Each structure stands twice: as C-alpha cells, then as structure tokens.
C-alpha cells in the first residue's frame, strides 16, 4: 500500500464528538445535559439500582436459591458434529478435544441427539442421551460409557 495516501475504510472511523465547544455545533453551553438538575451535575447522577427512594425492583422480589457446590457440565456434543470425521474410527474425548469440535473438557462428554448421522462410528463418551444412543445403534455404531 502506498504510504503518502493512507485512505481509511469507509465507515470504520468516525470523528469524536466535541462537547462544549460553541453553540453552533450543538452540545454547546449545557453540553447535552439540560438545565440545573442532578444529572447535569459533575459526578452523577444516581446508582443504576436506584428508583429515587422507591423500594427497588430486586428488593421487592424474593431470593431464589441455590447453587450446587459440585455441579458437572457434561456439554456439549450434538449428532451433526460427528459427521466431520470421514469416515472416522474411535471417537474419543481425547481426540475430540484436539480435533477442535470441543474447546474444553468439563468433567466428561455427553453426546446429544439433535440432528442426524449417516456413517459408521465407534463412539466413546461419558454419558449418552436416550435418543442419541438409539441413533448410534440404528446406524450400526457402538456407544460405550467410559
């Protein structure tokens, strides 16, 4: 690219809005904040969770616990993701992690029955759905729990 004309992409850059730099531009004296309010003052303004002294929305609603200490996230493999192997043998989470289908192992791998498969696969995982197991067994594949 030629250096003494560096033309930017159209729409990628925009001029910063000057605020309080004369009355002809707009955002003049009052600088876009109106006349003589709290919102026109320096430093705010109120909290985001504040209704002017009305009891706020979260404080009118009850708590809904709880959070489990040891929760496993067996997620996620769908049936259409298994079609990327041509033709594919020994579907392993150790193989699925380095293939790029699974970004991160979270305590196991569960294969779910959304979509469909058309090939013979030897499938190894931690858990299976009821529809996914039947879809593997209908194609002649083998599903085994680690």
């Amino acid at each position: 690219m030629k250096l003494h004309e560096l033309k930017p992409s159209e729409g990628s850059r925009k001029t910063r809005n000057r605020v309080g730099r004369g009355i002809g531009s707009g955002n003049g004296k009052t600088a876009g904040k109106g006349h003589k309010g709290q919102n026109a003052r320096s430093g705010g303004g109120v909290r985001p969770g504040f209704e002017g002294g009305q009891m706020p929305l979260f404080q009118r609603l009850p708590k809904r616990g709880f959070t489990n200490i040891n929760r496993k996230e067996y997620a996620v493999v769908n049936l259409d993701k298994l079609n990327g192997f041509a033709e594919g043998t020994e579907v392993t989470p150790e193989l699925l992690l380095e293939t790029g289908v699974i970004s991160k192992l979270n305590a196991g791998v569960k294969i779910l029955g959304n979509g469909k498969l058309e090939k013979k696969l030897t499938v190894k995982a931690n858990k299976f759905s009821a529809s996914a197991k039947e879809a593997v067994e209908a194609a002649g594949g083998t599903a085994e729990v680690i």
């Binding site: 929305l57 979260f58 404080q59 609603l61 809904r64």
Partner: protein, 64 residues
C-alpha cells in the same frame, strides 16, 4: 478494574435464553390467610422482567 456484579440481583434474577430474564413474584412469603387461592397459584409461578425494568437493570447483571 473489572465491572462488579450486583450480587443481590444475581440472587433474585436468572438469565434465560435471550432473555427476558426470569424472576419470581412478590407477595409469596407472608400472610396467606388474606389472599385467595387463585392469587397464590399465580404468584407461585414465575414471571418475566418488564422492558422498562429491563432497560434499567441489564447493566447490573452484565457478567451473569
């Protein structure tokens, strides 16, 4: 620094699948003799946070 998450709104509300956060109803913990059964079967169900409330509280729960 990182944006702090409003822990109270994290305890009340719950993110849904875009969302339209899930919430519970009020008037569901006290004085059930003065309320009818038709009120109680509807207040024990869940509700959705309204849009005028959503435009004010969605910044408080950005980090989920």
């Amino acid at each position: 620094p990182k944006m702090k998450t409003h822990r109270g709104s994290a305890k009340r509300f719950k993110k849904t699948g875009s969302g339209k956060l899930k919430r519970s109803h009020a008037y569901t913990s006290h004085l059930f003799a003065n309320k009818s059964q038709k009120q109680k079967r509807k207040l024990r169900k869940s509700a959705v946070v309204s849009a005028g409330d959503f435009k004010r509280i969605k910044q408080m729960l950005a980090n989920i």
